[PDB]
Design a protein around this ligand. Structure first.
Ligand code: MYP
Ligand code: MYP
Lengths: 214, 214
């Protein structure tokens, strides 16, 4: 695997979005991963609908939380995912407005990735952005820099956020993961969270996954 | 046994893989079975190395064919199976790169199952995906739907392929076996072959087996 890699300059990542006051992080983690997979496997980067997951996925609970695993399944079962433009984000659940004929992206499966961060970096560089669940301890008071919270304070037992691994590298010889958040661009480093890489920081390596598009 | 059952929605099946131009079907049939056994008995689904079998299993012949029975014996003798991440698939034989400390999965033995399809269904629903040898005639032209070639075209005595039973059920009162193939996802129904169940179709029930984990 390469020493460093980031998908933003390669066209596999959409701009940073904002979930607002809705606890829909899980939906953004999933669309971000699916957007990357569709670009790399079908050739076009599209901004996909988180709202479809909020309204047409009852296994998950919209603003009250969800799991990428259930999201991938819902998208497959529904028959596709619409774009942000055809099904805009409202920040709250509503009756399902999914239209099989409006869907432009399809999922056929999903995979759970390795818990080894070296292997995760290799997968990322070769197959695209990875959906990950993390403990958000080191994010609220976050501004910039490579975050490395006191280990016990960011354990995998309290994972409570879902985001996206977009790249990795080293800043002054300190390994990092470039993580796309969903709280707008005015947060952190242009909407991104940089986390220490190689220490199982905030359980970032424990629940990595990706959809398998058609 | 349940009227229907499929391990895909239950987390015991990895993504559909692709042999490439290599007669390594036997290796995929075996890793698929072991992946299911380790998930059910140890709790985690890991994508395992078919390459290990191509390079380290000397009773079999890598891209020119193999027997599930030989493969189970090799895995046991080697001391386990490494993951796809640690020992990636190349589609051709190489020198053995197996390393004891890299082994993440191990088996204690293997069993040959009954040819009775009702018993096989019951065993599948209770113990997991089953490795099966099959006459691949019906798969050569397969597009979709429940395959049921004429007897003389799919003789149960002309076995040439090895796949994995992942589920069973019925489509319009027609009983079927859901079979995971290893020719990529563009083949068949998203990489899967659906075969008539209850008629010993293509000898699918004649060489059923499974690794024993625990
Ligand atoms: C209120 C839900 C917020 C939302 C997004 C985080 S957020 O809104 O940006 C945020 C972060 C930090 C402080 C406040 C708000 N969180 C989630 O969707 C998280 C994401 C997640 C967590 C763990 C593993 C994988 C994914 N999931 C959820 O919160 N879920 C609700 C509980 C559910 N549990 C299932 C088992 O039985 C108990 C309930 C799982 C999904
Ligand atoms: C060139 C080998 C291809 C490979 C995988 C099939 S394949 O690549 O998907 C494909 C599909 C359709 C047409 C051609 C090729 N096949 C095998 O490994 C097959 C799988 C198999 C066959 C028979 C019983 C059990 C398992 N094995 C073999 O081809 N082997 C050679 C013959 C040997 N004898 C068979 C008869 O009894 C004594 C031993 C068994 C192993």
């Amino acid at each position: 695997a390469p020493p460093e890699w980031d998908w933003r300059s390669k066209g596999a990542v959409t701009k940073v979005k904002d979930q607002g006051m809705c606890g829909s992080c899980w939906a953004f983690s999933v669309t971000g991963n699916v957007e990357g997979q569709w670009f790399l496997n079908q050739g076009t980067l599209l901004s996909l609908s988180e709202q479809e997951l909020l309204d047409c996925d009852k296994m998950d609970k919209a603003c009250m939380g969800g799991l990428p695993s259930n999201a991938y399944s819902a998208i497959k079962n529904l028959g596709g995912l619409e774009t942000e433009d055809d099904y805009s984000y409202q920040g709250h659940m509503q009756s399902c407005q999914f239209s099989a004929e409006k869907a432009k992206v399809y999922i056929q499966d999903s995979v759970e990735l390795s818990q080894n961060e070296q292997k995760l970096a290799a997968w990322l560089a070769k197959r695209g952005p990875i959906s990950v669940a993390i403990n958000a301890f080191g994010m609220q008071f976050y501004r910039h820099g490579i975050s490395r919270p006191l280990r016990p304070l960011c354990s995998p037992w309290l994972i409570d956020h879902a985001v996206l691994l977009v790249g990795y590298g080293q800043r002054s010889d300190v390994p990092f993961w470039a993580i796309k958040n969903s709280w707008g661009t005015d947060w952190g480093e242009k909407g991104y969270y940089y986390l220490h890489r190689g220490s199982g920081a905030c359980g970032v390596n424990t629940m990595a996954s990706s959809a398998v598009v058609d």
